[PDB]
Amino acid sequence: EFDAIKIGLASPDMIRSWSFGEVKKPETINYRTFKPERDGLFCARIFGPVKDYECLCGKYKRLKHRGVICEKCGVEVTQTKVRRDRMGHIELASPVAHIWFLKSLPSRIGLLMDMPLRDIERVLYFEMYVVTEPGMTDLERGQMLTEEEYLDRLEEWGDEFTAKMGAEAIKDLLASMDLPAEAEQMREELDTTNSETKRKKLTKRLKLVEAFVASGNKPEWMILTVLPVLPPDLRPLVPLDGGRFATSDLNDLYRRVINRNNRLKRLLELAAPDIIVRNEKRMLQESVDALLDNGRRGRAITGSNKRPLKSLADMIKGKQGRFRQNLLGKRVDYSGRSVITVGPYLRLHQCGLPKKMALELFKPFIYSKLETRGLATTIKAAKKMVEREEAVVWDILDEVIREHPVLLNRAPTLHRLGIQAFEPVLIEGKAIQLHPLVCAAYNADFDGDQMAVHVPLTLEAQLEARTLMMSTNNILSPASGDPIIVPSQDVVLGLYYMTREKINAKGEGMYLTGPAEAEKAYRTKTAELHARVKVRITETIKHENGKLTTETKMIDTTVGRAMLWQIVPKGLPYSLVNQKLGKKQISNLLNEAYRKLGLKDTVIFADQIMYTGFAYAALSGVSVGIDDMVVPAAKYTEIAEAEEEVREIQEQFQSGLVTAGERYNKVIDIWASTNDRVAKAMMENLSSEQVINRQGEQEKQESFNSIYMMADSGARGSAAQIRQLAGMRGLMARPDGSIIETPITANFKEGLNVLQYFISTHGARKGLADTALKTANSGYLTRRLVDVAQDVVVTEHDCGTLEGVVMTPHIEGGDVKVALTELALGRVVSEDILKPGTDEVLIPRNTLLDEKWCKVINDNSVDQIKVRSVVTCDSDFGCCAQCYGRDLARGHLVNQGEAVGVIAAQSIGEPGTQLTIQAKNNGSVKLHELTIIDEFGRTKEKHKLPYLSKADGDAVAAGETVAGGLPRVADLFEARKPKEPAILAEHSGTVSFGKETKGKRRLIITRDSGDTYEEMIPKHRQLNVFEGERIERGDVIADGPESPHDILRLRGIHAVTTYIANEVQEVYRLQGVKINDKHIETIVRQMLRKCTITFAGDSEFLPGETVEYSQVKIANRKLVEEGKEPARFERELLGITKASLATESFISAASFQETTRVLTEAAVSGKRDDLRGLKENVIVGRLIPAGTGFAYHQDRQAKRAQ
Amino acid sequence: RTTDPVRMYMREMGTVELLTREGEIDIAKRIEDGINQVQSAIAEYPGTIPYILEQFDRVQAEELRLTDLISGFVDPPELAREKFNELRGKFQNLQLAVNEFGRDSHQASEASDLVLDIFREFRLTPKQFDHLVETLRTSMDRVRTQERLVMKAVVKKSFIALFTGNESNEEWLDKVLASDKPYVAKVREQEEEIRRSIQKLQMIEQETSLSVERIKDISHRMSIGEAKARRAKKEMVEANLRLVISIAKKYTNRGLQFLDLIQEGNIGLMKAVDKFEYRRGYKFSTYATWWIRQAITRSIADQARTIRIPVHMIETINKLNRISRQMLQEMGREPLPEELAERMQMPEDKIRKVLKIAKEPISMETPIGDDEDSHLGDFIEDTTLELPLDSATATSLKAATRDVLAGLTPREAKVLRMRFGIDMNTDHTLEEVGKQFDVTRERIRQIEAKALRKLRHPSRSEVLRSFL
RNA sequence: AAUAG
Ligand SMILES: [Mg+2]
Ligand SMILES: [Zn+2]
Ligand SMILES: [Zn+2]
């Protein structure tokens, strides 16, 4: 229907065209008949009838008279919904300045007229005159006159000049401006200017002036003469129960405006003294400002409730505004909510849904099937049958929900796995049954959690639920590619208990024909689960090439391991099961099943694993008791020794040998060492036991203690928590953060006393408060990321670019922090991977790196590769599939139409709650910094070289001595400048000292051309530069934190990308969060979207102008095709908030935040929104240009092309 | 330095000094002097005195209101009859000596001067005062328009030479026709337009019999008088703005803001200045307080409520509140409606009516319960919406009715369709249904009855029975 | 406001 949204100023004629009448009275409704009053705020003659196809007269009262205007009343015979669309207007007695174009800084009226805002308000507030037509006089336009001076010069000159005061004066000044003449004048003055401040001022004003010329807007439209009036049904006056009426504040504001306008007209008719008229004009301006934006001018007008009235700006803006409350999110039909319980019998694609809840949700479907099969004659009969709850209704409900998927949601929806589709199974009850294996995806536990349920209606929505959102499709984490349905808690415990090994168990040494006979022996009490036996195992191995090799052989194992092998799918080794299975081992089993067998086998295997784990956790009888907390006997001796040595240190303090700080430090170290020793003794005592073997000797066995089993299996519990249960609680911190000298020398088994419990509460409260506040901080960060990255969609397959990024193993010392395989898995090669010391092309260009090619890279000892990146993609809009690579949630190359920006933002934002020289290897030494290369050729030690045993190339043997989490991420993604940033070498050249000017110092550099560049340095700067040295560009002169903007300016796009990615990944890896770097690269790409033009060239770009990079690239391609001088630009790094606010579309920018500024700028500019991103199409109700809608939008782009 | 319009208004008002008794009498005297000059200017008009004479002729016949004729008498129908008979006699004398003895003759001037003296001892109602002013204003303005059109057409010095007495005389036209300056060819061409202009001028001059000099003198005198009266009135209003503020300070927090009350009081003060009388000896505050109070309170009665209540009901509500407060003080508990009705000497039903119509609308932003992020407007339904079940039932009924009609004879189906409006814009009575083929009301009625009888048979009505 | 996740 429509292809774009156009915004701009409104002329008086346009406002009159919108209007169906003029509001002349502040009347709303009669106080007896409750009918609209004529020419009032609710007039039926202006806005439409109050009843469908009726008039206030009651004369024309049917559809026979549609479109006929009653002569007695004037009310058109039509529908009542027209009162939601018909607008009105007020003819203002005096012009009024628009508050947005006056006080939304910077002021557009002031910028256009080149007069300060204070002067404009002085003219408006009737304090100072201003010259409109200077005439044949020394007076100039825009020069201010006081009343005294105005009277003086009125006597002096007379009618030669015109001087006015108020909004009429500003309108006359704006109407008399010659815009092309001003544009020429600013261009000429910019040609012959040197100061950068005046250059900025003239470039801003010139941009405004030429925007006004191009848009067709006239400046005097910024001063209102006709005021539009909203439809009444959008500001309703509706009756409540008991005769009370509820009204909108807009009615009060409009009534104030109308009353003051009528009083102004009456005063002008009475020829009142000028002071009264000036007062009335001030009040009219104040009333209109309050109606448009309350509180911007001054004291906000308040109603009888003593609270500020809500204006139109408040209608459209804010968290509670129309954009966010009603347009970006809505309340929906066919939805429900209930508490969630656990269904351990369900399959991964099934969810237990209550019968009554399904009956309410699927009601139209039940009506349709009752009508179809003849059980109900009409729809009212079907309604009666459903209300009476007949058995045939239940059969119809089963047939309806037979294969209809349903969507389950849990708030907060931190990532897309917070909504998944399931096949419903009708259950008796009122609680939703949720599959256990999906709980980790939902962050859902059964302690009172509630879930919402939605019914997809159309066939497309049903197929989207089945194909995309179904739980069996989403078993990999889109953030990292790791499985997300890994078993936890009881399952793991069961699999741990069944696969453990016991010495001299019943049935040891027995020979078993296979898993079935192991199960038979277990069920007959012949052998225990933990009996060491020999079992004939038939194992099938599916190789990389697809070879299926079957080998039968006798393996030493346990009964439980074979019984578990019974459910393992064919194609996997028995070594994955022939061990004790903790959480990590089961994770490995599922990962190998996915990597070597597929998706269906993995789903069946996961279901069987969870069934078996539950069953054998039940059969184990694992229980927690007070005797399971074994406190070591060494704890008391260690406490006594620590106390005695603390007394000795106190005695030394009283002798003056050591200071107070030393005493504090060594007491703390004493207690920390004591805690470590007690923990070690407790773990050693709890981890082992002594058993009698078959020969009768004593053997050491791993303990079957319940708490030890729970912790070791990874089901629940860790070393620190067992420490607290059976060892020492340890040193605790004060609310400010300092450590208390005496620790809690008691565990939870013994019980704390009052002081120890109070000290514990000190830290417990801090933890809870920190969680509560970081929730809001993380939410705001995630929203900002989603806004900045919402437009990134895979639009092509290959962009045909040769650029890429250099990838190397991450070395932060003597060990690898992360391997090259983990970084390269899923990325497309950009330059051929030649074998080291050889010219054979091991891996060609444009090949996805999967597990097989990762093993190939690892075997041949390759250090540095080059891969395609989203930051270096050349696509005009969005990115292409090759520059992105593998879709982590799907395992293959990313498909066209995938909204990867939203995925990146969710992947980064979801873990925000969790957020708070001697050689060690043998090889040679290479200098660049210090690098220690192994014999294979891989770089394994990267060390700094401050300004050495072995020189360059000299081999070194091992042992030779050659010689704040979430705020940090937010500051990195906002491109914040550090407080004391490092001073970097602006240009490459020879350093030279300079004249130490008072206050702060200066230095100079001589370039290769002999030109001298002067740098300004603060006094307190430990300069690392020496005269006569040719410092390269980007070299550090003064040490300090590095600004990302300086990195971009002096090193390039790759350097800033690496910096941001490394810092963010350092923060995330400190806490153990696995997030792929392509998400951070997508965000950084959205950060590098603007360029400032340095050379104007011949393209339609002004110097010093911040414009979109894609537009410049397209223009440069066109100009090169035309063989003309291209534009020269410097790319800019913006924060995610600033980048979001500086997008091309004003709908998205307004929907994000700062609605008034965005709308004011768009209105003065006359912007046009093409609806190219997701948010715009969400707001206007259209299909998003991603995924299933992608193709649709493409088709339209063809039809517009044709 | 400030943004509050209240503070700016006080700054602008404070710069005016306060009057004294002598100042008030002096300003009132200036107002009266200006009004007297205007009255004298209007009196020197041939159309003015006959209008007053005929108004008195109708009034003395006891057919018109006496107040509408005159409002007072200046003293340095017991008496009005004598003075108006004197006025009639002197008008006859002036008409006798207006032109027979000579316009410059002393009779025509002395009679007019003593007529001015007689008319100075009259206080007319302001309505016909403005009525007489407007006619001469319009005549003078039309003269201005014609003169400016003539100047625009001709464009100088020649007109300035003969503007004094020959502006409208045909001697100027003849002399222009005689002139032979190079630009007088186009001037002679424009003489055709100037002919129609001056012909239009002739009717107005004979309507006045004053030519141009006399009307110009009268216009200047009237303009000076109005300017002087306006200046004096402005001085009085600016002096008493502070009294307006002092009065309006007491009606805050009654639905109107402070500046609205100030402006309504200012309008009341201007109306008070329009009708002050310093001969009475009372000071200006005494009279002006009443008008300021009245203006402010009428403005509150008319503009303090979203739903407007008439003034009489506003008084009833306010006096109910006062009586309820006195009774609450008297007995110590809230007065029940019957006791209030007995004290008001009004029915209890009227008391309840006044009680529920005296409540202001609630805001849609008011929080619900103890919440602060909730709003009342978030919980208001749209009772005008149609349930989708009802829409589906309507479509089903349409389909069933069509199927049932398909089982009938086409004539009966069409007759029923026209008589009930099915698949048609309008319903039809028996007459126009007869107009189809045979115009027969008794026949159409019979066939409609037959169709209803067949549709009432249980064989073809079980489908439609389910919709009841 | 309070409460649940
Ligand atoms: Mg929970
Ligand atoms: Zn009507
Ligand atoms: Zn690309």
UniProtKB/TrEMBL annotation, chain B:
Ranges of residues in domain RNA polymerase sigma-70: 260-273, 429-455
Major subcellular location class: cytoplasm
Coiled-coil residue windows: none
Keywords, ordered alphabetically: Cytoplasm, DNA-binding, Sigma factor, Transcription, Transcription regulation
Single annotated GO MF: DNA binding
GO cellular component, as recorded: cytoplasm
GO BP of this protein: DNA-templated transcription initiation
Segments of this protein annotated with the region Sigma-70 factor domain-3: 315-391
Motif (Interaction with polymerase core subunit RpoC): 260-263
Location in or out of the cell: Cytoplasm
Annotated region described as Sigma-70 factor domain-4, given as residue ranges: 404-457
Protein task: Sigma factors are initiation factors that promote the attachment of RNA polymerase to specific initiation sites and are then released. This sigma factor is the primary sigma factor during exponential growth.
This protein's name: RNA polymerase sigma factor RpoD
Provenance organism: Vibrio cholerae serotype O1 (strain ATCC 39541 / Classical Ogawa 395 / O395)
Residues of the full protein shown: 95 to 619 of 621
